[PDB]
Amino acid sequence: TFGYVHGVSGPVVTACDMAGAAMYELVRVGHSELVGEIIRLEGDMATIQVYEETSGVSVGDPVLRTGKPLSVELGPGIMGAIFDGIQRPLSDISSQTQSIYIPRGVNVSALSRDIKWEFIPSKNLRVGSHITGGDIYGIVNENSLIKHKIMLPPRSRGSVTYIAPPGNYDASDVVLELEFEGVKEKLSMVQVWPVRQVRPVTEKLPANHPLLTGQRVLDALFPCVQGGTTAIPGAFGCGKTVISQSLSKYSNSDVIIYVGCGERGNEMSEVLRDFPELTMEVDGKVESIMKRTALVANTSNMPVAAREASIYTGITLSEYFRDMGYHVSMMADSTSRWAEALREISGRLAEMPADSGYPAYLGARLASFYERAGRVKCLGNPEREGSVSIVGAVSPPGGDFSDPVTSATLGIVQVFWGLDKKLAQRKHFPSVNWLISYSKYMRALDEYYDKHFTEFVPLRTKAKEILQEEEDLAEIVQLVGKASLAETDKITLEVAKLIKDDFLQQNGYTPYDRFCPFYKTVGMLSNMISFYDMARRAVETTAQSDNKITWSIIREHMGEILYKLSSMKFKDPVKDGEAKIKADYAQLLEDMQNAFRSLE
Amino acid sequence: TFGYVHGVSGPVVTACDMAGAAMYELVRVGHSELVGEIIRLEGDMATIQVYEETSGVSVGDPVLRTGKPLSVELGPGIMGAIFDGIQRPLSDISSQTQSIYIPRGVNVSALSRDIKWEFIPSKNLRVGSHITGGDIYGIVNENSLIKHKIMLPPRSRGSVTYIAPPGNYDASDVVLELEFEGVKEKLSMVQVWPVRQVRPVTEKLPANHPLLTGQRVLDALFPCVQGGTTAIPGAFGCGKTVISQSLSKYSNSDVIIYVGCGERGNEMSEVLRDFPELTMEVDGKVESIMKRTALVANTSNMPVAAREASIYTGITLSEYFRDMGYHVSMMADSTSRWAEALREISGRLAEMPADSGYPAYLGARLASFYERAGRVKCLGNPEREGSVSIVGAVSPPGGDFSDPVTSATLGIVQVFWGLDKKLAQRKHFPSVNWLISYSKYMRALDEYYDKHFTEFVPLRTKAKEILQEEEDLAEIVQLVGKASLAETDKITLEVAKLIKDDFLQQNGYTPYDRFCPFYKTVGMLSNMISFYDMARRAVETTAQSDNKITWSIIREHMGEILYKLSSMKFKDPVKDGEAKIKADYAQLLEDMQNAFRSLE
Amino acid sequence: YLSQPRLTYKTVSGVNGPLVILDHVKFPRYAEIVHLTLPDGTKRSGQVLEVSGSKAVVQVFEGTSGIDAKKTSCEFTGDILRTPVSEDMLGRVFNGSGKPIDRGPVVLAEDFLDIMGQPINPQCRIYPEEMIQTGISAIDGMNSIARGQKIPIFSAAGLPHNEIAAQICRQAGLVKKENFAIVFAAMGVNMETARFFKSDFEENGSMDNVCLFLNLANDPTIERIITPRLALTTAEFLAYQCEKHVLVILTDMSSYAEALREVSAAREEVPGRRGFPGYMYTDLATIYERAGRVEGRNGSITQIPILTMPNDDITHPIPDLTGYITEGQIYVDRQLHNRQIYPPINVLPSLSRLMKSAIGEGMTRKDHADVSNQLYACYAIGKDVQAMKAVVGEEALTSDDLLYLEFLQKFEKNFITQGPYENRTVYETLDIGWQLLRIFPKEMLKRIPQSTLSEFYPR
Amino acid sequence: QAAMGSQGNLSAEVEQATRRQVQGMQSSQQRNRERVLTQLLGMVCDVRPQVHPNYRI
Amino acid sequence: GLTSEQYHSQVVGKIGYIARCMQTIDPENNLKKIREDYQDVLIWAEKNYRFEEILEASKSGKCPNDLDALSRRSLILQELLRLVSSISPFKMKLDLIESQYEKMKQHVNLWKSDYHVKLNQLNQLTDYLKNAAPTPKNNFLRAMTSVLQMQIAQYGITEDNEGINQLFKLGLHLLAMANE
């Protein structure tokens, strides 16, 4: 129960009378109850790395012994909540303390125990029914958007002996009671899970469904899959805000978990100011994405343990909402800062410095964290299937992808959306460079595309090859100029420009292409590639004649068609329904076919 | 008598109750009686580097104290045998145990005591004759290649009281009884010598005769003498093991001891598979070279602490056979593995490391081991002249020659055959880097060259000049190109390419290039240098004239002669006689002369 | 057999990193195994890394997190780690600790084999000489494998080393113109990699003869130190006692080496280059050297470790020591992969130490060695010509340089490039090599002797 | 649509083979179980207590 | 994926869940075909086995413990239960329920099935209407959704009924359409 502080040197506190303590357990040191992690044991002397500043912690101070490791506290109240990396509810600490600082050793519960929740038990469950870990034994109306399914913890099972009637309950109320081998377990609406322990699932299915974002470049050229693993460069003008906002507002992800993991103070202030104001249209009503989002936000002056465990807290919350049956999108703002916190912990423990000073396990930690992303058959009786898509961003030193953190992240992840400050300056938004980006889920999504969007795969391959050919010809243009380019080279260049400026380029502020449905995206790409193929066919088949066609001839004859191709962006998905947009694109293709037939 | 194991940290055991155990004394640790050597001695406890895996050794296990240092049995039965690191005959172990492994603690005799050797005493020796250390008091007909001289152990002396008559004697039968100061010493045909003490020799004469390897580059550009010290640094795959094996097969050493210290076991198996087939003609009769080769195999996965014992056993065997009057050649397969074993034992001992973790005495150990090489005036009454040429491969980690082991080895060895990974990748074997490599015996071998191959020293000097000039011209060309090259510079480049591709590099796995006699090594160089002289003379003397002769003209006119020079390496020393090869090289020289005359 | 009851100690003196430390141990045995029941009933395993008097440092395989000092009870098995081995292990899936994860029963042991094995008497070791027809041109033609050889696949993150290994598995057979049991250990491999290998072995009818030891990324780190040894002990039983021919595939030897570095750092052992323990060479040797044939036994163990070179650095300690130990390496090239050449194998840094004896007259064809050497030389000269051309441009290249560039293009397009399911015979690979070499005139092929050129060149 | 037929036949055949194997195993175990049990129980009952070899005095 | 103890606990829980789904869908024991198919798992629910005893049976193998097969069968039952519940006021004939059960069982993969997608859409509409306040849009949605539930009950979801497809399309479009 109670230890005592036998010594204090920096953040390391050696506690006596700690015979029963467990390795990597959590302890409240001092009279202010500073959080601390047992990092060593020697007889009764347990060494503790104290998260908060140890100034004023005097010998003889009691050391309360929490019977758990660093464990997130799951249950209603997560949604719309701003936590620290340690699950400290900043938004509740500020309200209760009426201060701009975080009091040393603040012990505010992660989830409010006073707020009441409308809880409806599973109708089938009774007294005596067999229940198993992962079973949804109730549903709580947390929001008009997210129904929080209260479910049994893993490692728990038995026969229900009391299930509460529908009503208003708090996180401290006992909503269920079960028995196994005579041992009786009373379960409230809140459970606790170690952050560093993977939440079990009945099976980890392959990722076979897109994580649509609405950005044409991301959805079409470089698709990510629900349960995917993605990386994003972190720079000043890169534009990661567009990716975060798209995933938060328009993506099919049922839940969003944004982990700052040690950002600058003002950067985190910007995130905390912007995310609450973002709104999404669900069921015709403009709700707030914070009805379904949670923010594990912490700055660079927070406890290093909090910064290093922010990623684990975020992934554990994402896994919880996945098991609930949802599709969650976790977004680490900069895993580089988490890796810096990890290196700092290694230095504090005086562990051997591995490659470029990072710990001897950086790759293992990153791989194990990214392994928690995926699509699973959620554990429990109600057949569910959730997912956790990690979009953790990394910060390459000066644009170099060779540092240990970026190298490990690129090796582990399967998508890299490669935002570019160069394109940001050129005003090509989104700034995805579409040359260093990549996606390894194309072979996984082949089945989905063939079922729903049959032609999209050849369209995307042709677009990618067009862009590659344009990149290769960019050098030839310098050597011999544009006048020396063949007609096929000219058509490739002038459709590559069309794709760059009119397909990849997309403005998130306009009401018509802030969110681009995949049907619209594939329609635009199909029209562009049809133009390219038919122009190339005309050029090749008139190369043999004296009246050979040229790109100049085609442009002069069909300036209207090129204008319409450029204006395909301006079709509003909302006002111009799917049927209307598809019909208009089909009419456009008819016009192109008529014009090309007349010209040829 | 008996100490008791106290702890086990890997190869390093700790033993109590060893009050009087001497440093570097031999003990038997455990119930299986694993051999071990004391390395430190604190209080009444000792610490023992165990030469066999210590897994399963428990505290309290007996530790017998054999009051002797690590020593080798020297006598008949060494030639043709493959011992382990601590001189146990692996063939005898296999025959005794009928298993494909080496049992831990097997205590089989080093030299078989059952074989009846044909022993002939020295005719002059009689009862009452004064005999001393190193005195050859017998000859044993070990095999057709080796007349094993039976010599008094060093540090032995006295008046002979019984010399065995000629006949068949086993290694255990007493062969010579002598007396000194009254005390009587009986001697069989086997003498035990501590491996860490240098066997005395009357004098260490200067090395003055080549160690003719089978490799053109080593023989010509970087000679090694009988009694010299050589190092072969190189990254994995460069070919130092193949150089060692080629020297082991085709060289003028009457005895060759391969040490396989910490390298593949497949290599030792290949040695055993190949050498019995290889034969050398003695007095017109073909006799296998395994009759003179003695392997000391301790593969990489065999106990780490046994590698030092392996090196010391190999050098002690080489010294023993040197003391007979033979020019032994000790191939240390990898001294880097010995250095690594020292580093592991030091780490277990918690010693303070030198550069890159190696112990502070690695350089001293390497110097002491290499200092046992020089040609000697063997001990004893019959005047002789032995030698021990230590050819020691080095294995720098990452191919970096700044490695502490490689640096310390270059600080001792007199010949440095550095190998190049780029050449090895190009398959330019032997991969010796002609630039960095060197030999400090050239001035000591010019005496022999001027009398046996009088026309070779100027050829060697000119070849090295050509290679250096080509190196400079290549450094220039890499940035500027061959457009501005002077014609003589072009000829230097082309002759250097010829020398590289067709003189230096030598495919060691062919019937023709496996062994390159020195008459071939000098004839090829002579023809190439003569062509160089003729081309340079032509161009220089025709630079002023109008009919400017250039490299292009020379190459076009002499495409056939250049190809003949290239294919000179294909001459077979065995299928085609020495007379035929010399005649063909003379004919090619005549062709060169006639072609140049007709060209000018 | 051990009949005495085994002692259970609650005397856990201290815990630090992955090293429990027990006191009052009665005659601790080094390398002994211990079973730790934690306070919450969780049963972990550990190995005694050190003994001193009444102390025993127990490295726990699952990590020391949650270990208590007064309540954890560690029972000492009385014996070093022994795997239960039976032929029925073929066609099963085990985790990294040999415990089944295919919902089958535990292994009904035919024998109990020490996990570390024993070094094979070099005098009794046979030298591999039976060339394996992997069907990959880059391997058969120029890095020929031999049955009983340690030839790791050096690669980098994201490259098709898994695809190359699976292809070798599914089209590896002797050049005799019998099946290869497969023992596949995976250390810290993502679920996608594990599923790829399992699904490929199932798509082919080889899941009867394949035994999988799996230790994914989320699984315990220390258990990777024993996964290779479990796999190689099973392979040794199947080869030297059951006379099977076992292809052992150890995936993510980089993960194994990093786990070893973690343990060494916890122990504060002497570090080598880039922090890896000073004995990493000896440990990797204990892993790799459990290969090759053996006298009097018709079995063999062929090892193809797949290791990821950090930052594509072939001089990184892991690949460097692995090259020092093993008998070659197949180098998967990022440049070729980016150019979309499959398999992206760079023969220049690749190597096979037993090709010299596995090729020639008798086995395969008699022009094999000459063709391979000439292809190596011409490929290297083509690369040098490319490098010089980057500087001097096209117009400064001589006709010979153009010949070499054409050879390089056609060699990377017709020899290295190959269908993922295309199984070229050694003779087909040599014919491709000859049609490539025929680009040059005879005089430009200086490696191949005139005797070979006259017979093989004209056709 | 027509490929689904062979699954039932394959399942039936392999189930019959598995039944044959299980019956064979059961017969062999019944044949040689009693002596195994007797030996196991005799060996379990035989105790023969002894101290560690490393113990002295 | 799952330790042995947790796997057998999952087996027990899935048997219990199948029993609960059967009790909810067919409290009157009228779905004889479905109950016969699920007999082997419903035998452990008919009698009063405790969790410990049923777990012991699952470990011994006496009760069905192939968790993948149990999941497939439980999903086949649960999709039918969802179909019956989404049209709660409008009951479905026993013949139609049995035919739909057979179709779901025959389907290769329910979690990617058109039946599953249609049920998801209907549940979207029903969940919205369960709490939406009375307005023009909400009254329209309730009317169209009630007609859709009637059509589903009278026809079912295992076909390409043009009327049901039109109702789904229009209802979802109106639901997505802005309130104003």
Ligand SMILES: Nc1ncnc2c1ncn2[C@@H]1O[C@H](COP(=O)(O)OP(=O)(O)O)[C@@H](O)[C@H]1O
């Ligand atoms: N003289 C030679 N002739 C032909 N090939 C050689 C020669 N020396 C080395 N090689 C090649 O180099 C490779 C490595 O040889 P080896 O020396 O055993 O490796 P290491 O340098 O690691 O000891 C072999 O596979 C062999 O083909």
